[PDB]
Amino acid sequence: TTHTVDAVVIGAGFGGIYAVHKLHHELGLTTVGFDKADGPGGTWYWNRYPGALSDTESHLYRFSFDRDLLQESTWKTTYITQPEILEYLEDVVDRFDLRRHFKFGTEVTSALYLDDENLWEVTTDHGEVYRAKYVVNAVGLNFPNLPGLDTFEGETIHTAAWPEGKSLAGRRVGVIGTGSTGQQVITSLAPEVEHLTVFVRTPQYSVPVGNRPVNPEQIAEIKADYDRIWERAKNSAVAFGFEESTLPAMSVSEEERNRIFQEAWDHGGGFRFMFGTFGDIATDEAANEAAASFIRAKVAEIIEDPETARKLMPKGLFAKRPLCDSGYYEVYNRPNVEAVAIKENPIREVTAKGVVTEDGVLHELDVLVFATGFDAVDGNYRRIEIRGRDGLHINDHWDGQPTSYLGVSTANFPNWFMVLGPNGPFTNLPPSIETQVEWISDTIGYAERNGVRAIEPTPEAEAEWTETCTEIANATLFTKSVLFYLGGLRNYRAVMAEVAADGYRGFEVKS
Ligand SMILES: Cc1cc2nc3c(=O)[nH]c(=O)nc-3n(C[C@H](O)[C@H](O)[C@H](O)COP(=O)(O)OP(=O)(O)OC[C@H]3O[C@@H](n4cnc5c(N)ncnc54)[C@H](O)[C@@H]3O)c2cc1C
Ligand SMILES: NC(=O)c1ccc[n+]([C@@H]2O[C@H](COP(=O)([O-])OP(=O)(O)OC[C@H]3O[C@@H](n4cnc5c(N)ncnc54)[C@H](OP(=O)(O)O)[C@@H]3O)[C@@H](O)[C@H]2O)c1
């Protein structure tokens, strides 16, 4: 059974929800949405592990496009939890009636271009087939081979498939992984579990998030100033709601530096620490080191036991998405929390009763939690039968690193777009999702008005875009993995407006 539509939107997180709203309400296109999830919410649908929390502040982790909605939504704390965000995204879907454009619990399994007809032939896992003029892919994004893993008699849980309402209260838990998800899950588990063992491979740099109850209504004061808030964020590099400093770290005294660091520490927020204090933490070695040493002193001060402190001490460049936490380091002071540094004491095997390390101790567990991420990020592209012009498979097109033109498109796949594809901005992401979806929507409307049959980037333009992302990246310390565009949102937005205004420079446009 075969349906013919104007647009397919794959995914129902922030990106897919807005794409469907744009393509249907603005453009008047027959548009169908899909998601494996049973509901909208995307990453916030799947991720229900304890202590799930935004690193963007509450008032800015949301859409900006609707003024009334912005005046309507509420929240409890300065930062927003998974249940609050998910119910927000459910409210967005209800607000604009997008529910009836979505097929939930429905996986897209093939998207094939039809060269002679100029259409995409897209099929689900219930064998329905959609013939579409445009595809918008807002698809978003790992089990450590551990010997004897399935010998384990307790529960094994990955962070990304946390069984609904499962509590670990009163259990013996092991946590493997100390990324953003690891730290949250660890801070949240420490108070409730009978015992907790963390297996840390790379300890990370992390600052206080400063997640505070919000004042009766000084939600009101932000709501009264929302147009300015969003205009500023749109006109900044990372759109996290503070002035991004230009002040070189090493051009003030030791005591001013410490003072400025301390005030960011106490206010909290990860990007604020990296980009709100000074302007060169990411591009100058001594500045980076200075921010690095500050955090390490914090760690040395907070963790009382010298040996525990040592295992948790972050080292090297403070040059990965700045982490922020709700008392992560302090957790290691509790008598039922234990850290194992697996670089120096590797995991030997898992057995019925728990994890055995190379020192030959059995860490008896009831539950093993993997906060170990997913294998790949481009996997929602690589796992689908996606074929563009001349039957060229996406995996063969991206025979190396995945590429894009402008973060939203790629050679050989006409009328096929990406929300947060490779080589795109690195930012508080909803305002970048909006930028991309707005532009993709503008583009699709343009094609409709102008009897365009196919639009796709040139290999030159795409390759020039990669060179552009690689130049900007090489100026930063984040080099020394995937290539973001690191010019910031303002720059990115100008790049996008310019391309559209200059009549889609870099794109081949068949009519
Ligand atoms: C715990 C956590 C906290 C985060 N907090 C922040 C934050 O504070 N600030 C920030 O800027 N970013 C944050 N992020 C990143 C987050 O990914 C983005 O902010 C944004 O929510 C992603 O939206 P999305 O629409 O691009 O992708 P997603 O939300 O991942 O949605 C993609 C959808 O694609 C679906 N899908 C994939 N393939 C198929 C297919 N073949 N068929 C059907 N459906 C498919 C998936 O099921 C998923 O529902 C966080 C991420 C995590 C994991
Ligand atoms: N969308 C994008 O463009 C983009 C770009 C970059 C990153 N991301 C990531 O998406 C992630 C969400 O997932 P997450 O935080 O749960 O995972 P994560 O950031 O990949 O971190 C996984 C943690 O588990 C550890 N780990 C991984 N494999 C291990 C193993 N085999 N044995 C022991 N430890 C292991 C890692 O340690 P090590 O540090 O030693 O490996 C790390 O501490 C974000 O954290 C974000 O960084 C997205």
Describe the fold and architecture.
With 511 residues, the chain is α/β, with parallel strands linked by helices. The protein has 2 domains: 1-144 and 375-511, FAD/NAD(P)-binding domain, CATH 3.50.50; 145-374, no CATH class. Helix content is 32%, strand content 20%. It has 16 helices and 22 strands. Strands 1, 2, 5, 6, 7, 8, 19 and 20 form an 8-stranded mixed beta sheet that branches. The protein has a 5-stranded parallel beta sheet with strand order 9-18-10-11-14. Helix 1 (14-26) runs parallel beside helix 14 (429-449) and helix 14 (429-449) packs parallel to helix 16 (489-501). The protein is globular. The two termini are 30 Å apart. Residues 10-16, 34-37, 42-43, 45, 47, 52, 54-56, 61, 107-108, 138-140, 181, 380, 384, 419-420, 428-429 line the site of flavin-adenine dinucleotide. Flavin-adenine dinucleotide (FAD) binds at residues 10-16, 34-37, 42-43, 45, 47, 52, 54-56, 61, 107-108, 138-140, 181, 380, 384, 419-420, 428-429. InterPro entries: FAD-binding_Monooxygenases, FAD/NAD-bd_sf, Flavin_mOase-like. NADP(+) 1 binds at residues 55, 178, 180-181, 184, 201-202, 321. Belongs to the FAD-binding monooxygenase family. NADP(+) 3 binds at residues 178, 180-181, 201-202. Keywords: FAD, Flavoprotein, Monooxygenase, NADP, Nucleotide-binding, Oxidoreductase.
Fold topology:
Layout: E1 2-10, H1 14-26, E2 31-34, H2 43-46, E3 53-57, H3 67-72, E4 79-81, H4 82-95, E5 102-103, E6 108-114, E7 119-124, E8 129-137, E9 155-158, E10 172-176, H5 180-189, E11 195-200, E12 206-208, H6 219-224, H7 226-234, H8 254-267, H9 270-275, H10 285-302, H11 306-312, E13 323-325, E14 337-341, E15 347-351, E16 354-357, E17 362-364, E18 367-370, H12 379-382, E19 385-387, H13 394-397, E20 416-418, H14 429-449, E21 454-457, H15 459-474, H16 489-501, E22 507-510
Helix pairs in contact: 1-14, 14-16
The chain binds flavin-adenine dinucleotide and NADP nicotinamide-adenine-dinucleotide phosphate.
